[PDB]
Symmetry: C2
Subunit: 112 residues, 2 copies
Amino acid sequence: RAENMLWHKLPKSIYFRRGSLPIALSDLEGKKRAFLVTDRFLFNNGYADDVVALLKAQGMEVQTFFEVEADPTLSVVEKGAAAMQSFQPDVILALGGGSPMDAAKIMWVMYE
Amino acid sequence: RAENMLWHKLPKSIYFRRGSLPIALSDLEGKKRAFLVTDRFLFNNGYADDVVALLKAQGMEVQTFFEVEADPTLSVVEKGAAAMQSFQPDVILALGGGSPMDAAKIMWVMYE
């Protein structure tokens, strides 16, 4: 007979406004390698260009990965993992809605 | 002319119940050196004994510091900093209410 543990834990760091992006990423000093996780629709739009330009702003070796559809598959996850672990990036950029981010996380940890 | 940043940031990890202590500190594996920050009243009570016993539970090189009164002083802060930086602890244990904790923080960073 005994009692339990309940929980409340949060990510440490969050930003929120219009035009956050530049002032949000301003504090990104010497993190050197970067990797993009996104979808080809959004990457197709004039959106990824913005962030890679801001990555050039101090100049990062990056590569866009827009190769996830509506779901994590067990098929993109390993190609993305293999590609980035070929790259050995040191910062991972999750973009978008639903599938792009979490699959990244997964293959992210697969890099670890 | 431009807009600003507002904020919301939190410590990552918190526990909350009755008898948290053992199940809270259970996840404290190989952190090896420990330092106590407390007051001589509370240390005088049968309270510090409990935590140092649980520190022995896997066995930590620790030392109690109960030498702060109702306030940070500019006098205890440096003796505590000097003592711990003689010890080089790697985990700092803040105990109590008001003055004991924050002064620690201060001299904590003075160690850094």
